[PDB]
């Protein structure tokens, strides 16, 4: 909760210094225990894009890491939804 | 540097890499379907491709000139490949977004994949004439099912503009156009939940002069000479106008099949021939007045017919009598209300549904006309 809610409280543009580590960890692995790491992107898919129709370039590389990591993860049958709709509304 | 799709353009990357990977992966694995992560990635890329961008028209709208054509062609080809199988992954509704991506028709000269899908659909194109165990896909349970009706209805729907080839209008399209028109009876087979689910698709060229010039055409298309379709497409209008009855519940599909080709939905020569917009539309508007107002015909048979100064007063007076019957019914229900579960609640539901559908058909264009006439 304190990672979920402190972001979506006040500010619009603060998510540039943080998610370099999230991209590094999306390159690292896709652990089903660490599904919250996917859920922050899963809520940022709608709530991060506040108003103003901004870039797609940085967020491609997490999607390509998920494409490369489509083969390993199995046993996380419920968690597949989070990696899907990031590029739809962006 | 030329900012191509795969080279530079990130807007083209999500389409290019996804469609190329799909056409490489499942086009190869389709032989593996018919008898660790192949199934998981298959069900992943299924809905990642069907809903890569929910705004399918917004994706390929103005993102790139030629990439939309190549990618819509590859997507519809991949849809035509695995259309025959009966797997668990449902995409009959998801095909509607891909179909809507087309009119919101490009240059199909680069490849004839649309012709491939059309020829596969030509296996059982004429639905009621060819309905048998040799039906589409030759299936008993494989592809012969309920989803194909909605697929033909919504997925085959190009309302923007017919800039396609349309070269087989005398042989391929005319086959399902004419075998349907072989008789007045639609003649659907068992499990006929709705025989009008083919489409509201038919128009004037979109026995006949073009097919009469089979060697000559097979480039004098039938759409060029509008008189030959205009003869025998409009000749059947008087046949349906003559066929009627006093009892309403007998003829259920009488209004539906005529209302599509009769009125102003036929854009081909609607402004050229005034009869298609004026007289056939007047007949197709007057026929429901005698058809639906009888209480014998139920709403479930003619529930959703989504599609004039003369018939306006007739509808108003007959609906005044119908609402007076509803009010007498309400006065009856107030005095010693019996068990509403048996026939009264369903009667009120049927009356409300009929009145709401009539009011909605008035609110399409006739409500503003009624306001203007009342002011006049």
Swiss-Prot record, chain A:
Channel activity is modulated by phosphorylation. Phosphorylation is increased in failing heart, leading to calcium leaks and increased cytoplasmic Ca(2+) levels. Disruption phenotype: Embryonically lethal. Embryos die at about 10 dpc, due to defects in heart tube development. Cardiac myotubes display enlarged rough endoplasmic reticulum and cytoplasmic vesicles that contain high levels of Ca(2+). Highly expressed in heart, lung, cerebellum and brain. Detected at lower levels in adrenal gland, stomach, thymus, esophagus and ovary. It is found in: Sarcoplasmic reticulum membrane. Homotetramer. Can also form heterotetramers with RYR1 and RYR3. Interacts with CALM and S100A1; these interactions regulate channel activity. Identified in a complex composed of RYR2, FKBP1B, PKA catalytic subunit, PRKAR2A, AKAP6, and the protein phosphatases PP2A and PP1. Interacts directly with FKBP1B, PKA, PP1 and PP2A. Interacts with FKBP1A and FKBP1B; these interactions may stabilize the channel in its closed state and prevent Ca(2+) leaks. Interacts with SELENON. Identified in a complex, composed of FSD2, CMYA5 and RYR2. Cytosolic calcium-activated calcium channel that mediates the release of Ca(2+) from the sarcoplasmic reticulum into the cytosol and thereby plays a key role in triggering cardiac muscle contraction. Aberrant channel activation can lead to cardiac arrhythmia. In cardiac myocytes, calcium release is triggered by increased Ca(2+) cytosolic levels due to activation of the L-type calcium channel CACNA1C. The calcium channel activity is modulated by formation of heterotetramers with RYR3. Required for cellular calcium ion homeostasis. Required for embryonic heart development. Belongs to the ryanodine receptor (TC 1.A.3.1) family. RYR2 subfamily. The calcium release channel activity resides in the C-terminal region while the remaining part of the protein resides in the cytoplasm. This is Ryanodine receptor 2. The chain holds residues 2605 to 2694 of 4966 of the full protein.
